[PDB]
Each structure stands twice: as structure tokens, then as C-alpha cells.
């Protein structure tokens, strides 16, 4: 590691993930069968669509080490416990770990014409 601080924070993040981690398995993607640990967070948000239409839901996310997620790409599908999630956006590398913003549906159809 470049500095003392980088190694220290790597060990600290590893301990955090060990003590507060949930096992998640990727299903469809380049890492077809990897198993990854992370901290699972499911906060709440509600937005209104008009006069009365209220849409109630949640925005889950996952906190994983960036070394085992290098091959991961947007649109992949992974499972935690019983329910299934897909990867929405992968946060930039902070320290030694990065977030996996997730969605609870099936992946959307793609628009790109490549």
C-alpha cells in the first residue's frame, strides 16, 4: 500500500465487513458464480406522483471491497438471502471499498444500439 493509512483503513474496512456482513451471490454476469460479503442497508423513501398518487418503496445498497467487484458491470443480477437484486450504479473507489446501489426488480431492457 502507498501509505500507512491505506493499509490501516483496509484492515479496518475488512473488520467492519467481517462483523457486519451478509453473504451475496452474483448470478448473471462476468463473475457468474462469485460470493461476496458486504453490509446491507435498506432505507425508506416515498415520492408523490400528483394529487393523491403516493408511491412507497425503498432504495437498497451494498458495501463491498472494490477488488472483487472489478469485473462487475451494470445490469448484473445478484441475490441476498431469498429476494433478488440487480446492480444500478457502482460508486467510485473510496479508500478500499465501494458501494453497490441496487434495485429490487428484474433488469430493464437496454437502449444502446451497439
Amino acid at each position: 500500500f502507498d501509505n500507512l493509512f491505506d493499509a490501516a483503513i483496509a484492515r479496518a474496512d475488512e473488520t467492519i465487513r467481517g462483523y457486519m456482513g451478509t453473504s451475496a451471490t452474483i448470478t448473471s454476469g462476468e463473475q457468474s458464480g462469485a460470493v461476496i460479503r458486504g453490509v446491507f442497508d435498506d432505507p425508506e423513501n416515498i415520492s408523490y406522483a400528483g394529487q393523491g398518487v403516493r408511491v412507497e418503496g425503498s432504495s437498497p445498497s451494498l458495501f463491498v471491497r472494490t477488488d472483487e467487484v472489478r469485473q462487475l458491470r451494470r445490469g448484473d443480477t445478484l441475490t441476498i438471502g431469498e429476494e433478488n437484486f440487480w446492480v444500478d450504479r457502482v460508486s467510485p473507489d473510496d479508500g478500499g471499498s465501494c458501494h453497490l446501489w441496487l434495485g429490487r426488480g428484474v433488469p430493464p431492457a437496454v437502449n444502446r444500439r451497439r
Binding site: 415520492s47 394529487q51 393523491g52 398518487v53 403516493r54 432504495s59 426488480g105
Partner: protein, 131 residues
């Protein structure tokens, strides 16, 4: 006439075709990710036309709004709007008894960027009835 039977008639004529969607009658409509393809029907902006001397005339706008998950492709909404809603809405035998004149108006797409939980698209009509 009374708004209740008009929405009842349009929902009856709209349910017969299989869509597999949850239909909401009236303005209040609360749901979550489970029943996502919901379709809501409501009337808004009633006014006194004052067109004919013989009897009362009113104008109101009839809305048919469908909700689809955020980041769903645009082309999917196109199909839901045109292929499903437009053909059924043109001719409904039950409507012609109540509505003296029904005129189309353009549909429009609205997405949500504050939280990214919904994306809807409502077809608007202009209704001229008698109260």
C-alpha cells in the same frame, strides 16, 4: 351525468381486454413495487360551458394514466399508450349514452428523478356532457 357512472363505464370497457394490471378508480391511489403497472382514471377541471340555451352543458377532462417502473425503456411506454389504450378508447358503446362529445388530446411522458421510483404517462381527453 354523475362522474361515478362515467368512470365505471370506462373502466368496465377497459378491463375486458386482458392487461394484467391493477386499475384504480378515482384520484387517491397508493401502491408499491408489487402492483406496478397500475392504471388510474379520474376527471379534473370541470367547468360551466354555457354553450346551449336549452339546458346545462359542462366540460371536463378525462385522464387515463399508467405507471411503469423508472428506467423502463421509452419504447415500452409508447406501446402501452398507443397499442392498448388508444384502440379501446375510440369506441365504447356505454359512453355514447352519457357523453355528447369526446375529443382526444395528446399524451405526455413524465419521469421521476428525485427518487427514481416511478415513471408515468397519461392520455388526456376533453369531455362535454350535461349535468
Amino acid at each position: 351525468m354523475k362522474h361515478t357512472e362515467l368512470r365505471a363505464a370506462v373502466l368496465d370497457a377497459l378491463e375486458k381486454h386482458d392487461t394484467g394490471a391493477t386499475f384504480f378508480d378515482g384520484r387517491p391511489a397508493v401502491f408499491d413495487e408489487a402492483d406496478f403497472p397500475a392504471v388510474a382514471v379520474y376527471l379534473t377541471g370541470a367547468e360551466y360551458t354555457g354553450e346551449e340555451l336549452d339546458s346545462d352543458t359542462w366540460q371536463a377532462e378525462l385522464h387515463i394514466e399508467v405507471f411503469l417502473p423508472a428506467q423502463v425503456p421509452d419504447s415500452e411506454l409508447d406501446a402501452w399508450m398507443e397499442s392498448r389504450i388508444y384502440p379501446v378508447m375510440s369506441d365504447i358503446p356505454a359512453l355514447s349514452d352519457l357523453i355528447t362529445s369526446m375529443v382526444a388530446s395528446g399524451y405526455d411522458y413524465r419521469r421521476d428523478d428525485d427518487a427514481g421510483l416511478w415513471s408515468s404517462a397519461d392520455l388526456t381527453y376533453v369531455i362535454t356532457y350535461e349535468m
